[PDB]
Design a protein around this nucleic acid. Structure first.
Lengths: 120, 96
DNA sequence: CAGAGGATGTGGCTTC
DNA sequence: GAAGCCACATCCTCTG
């Protein structure tokens, strides 16, 4: 799969698309990579961060690190960001010490995913 | 609230209960909230007549009604041939 | 076979 | 006015 940069250069994650609908089977499931050697078994949770509603509702939000690559069976975004607004979703790794990479402008969570707009 | 301007099911369905002349297709069943279903496929037909949706059937209209459960508008009378009931003590927090 | 239910497009309608 | 809502439409699936 394809990766993108982070706000901790020690870890990387999936290319979560521009704009999507409230609660869909993601078009590409979520991979989270450990460059720094991590005990394969450590837990990873995510929290949708936005100046508005700073904790949105998520499902299958917790995942297990395995072979230095934590993957999420199927993460789903329920709690909406707002108009033009995206999520700076936080990414936790439960270790000693635990570490996080902030991730600005992750994905726009609205009611319609961008359907080819109206024909009137 | 948006029931006013654009037509609903529950707002529409009860144009037919209250009106005596549509008992051909439905009726109030008892003192407590319940409702019977006369023609299961003439009902859906008129909801097509309003919605401009000629392909409409029971299976289609019905699904829409089964959404209502999780939102606390109405509920099912279990095992009864095509009979549910309205939750009003909730319609008024849903129009509070 | 009805009935609860996930998924996903649809059309009308407020909000920026 | 596209961008967010909304409340069905449509659909194919199980499992009581």
């Amino acid at each position: 799969a394809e990766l993108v940069r982070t706000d901790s250069p020690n870890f990387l994650c999936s290319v979560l698309p521009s704009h999507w609908r409230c609660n869909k089977t993601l078009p590409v499931a979520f991979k989270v990579v450990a460059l720094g050697e991590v005990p394969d078994g450590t837990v990873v949770t995510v929290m949708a961060g936005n100046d508005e509603n700073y904790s949105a509702e998520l499902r299958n939000a917790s995942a297990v690190m395995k072979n230095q690559v934590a993957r999420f069976n199927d993460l789903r975004f329920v709690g909406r960001s707002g108009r033009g607004k995206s999520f700076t979703l936080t990414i936790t790794v439960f270790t000693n010490p635990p570490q996080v990479a902030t991730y600005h402008r992750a994905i726009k969570v609205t009611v319609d995913g961008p359907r080819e707009p109206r024909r009137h | 609230m948006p029931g006013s301007g654009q037509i609903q099911l529950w707002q529409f369905l009860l144009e037919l209960l209250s009106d005596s002349a549509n008992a051909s297709c439905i009726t109030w069943e008892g003192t407590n909230g319940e409702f019977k279903m006369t023609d299961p496929d003439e009902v859906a037909r008129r909801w097509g007549e309003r919605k401009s949706k000629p392909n409409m059937n029971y299976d289609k209209l019905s699904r829409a009604l089964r959404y209502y459960y999780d939102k606390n508008i109405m509920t099912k009378v279990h095992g009864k041939r095509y009979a549910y009931k309205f939750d009003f003590h909730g319609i008024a927090q849903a129009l509070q």
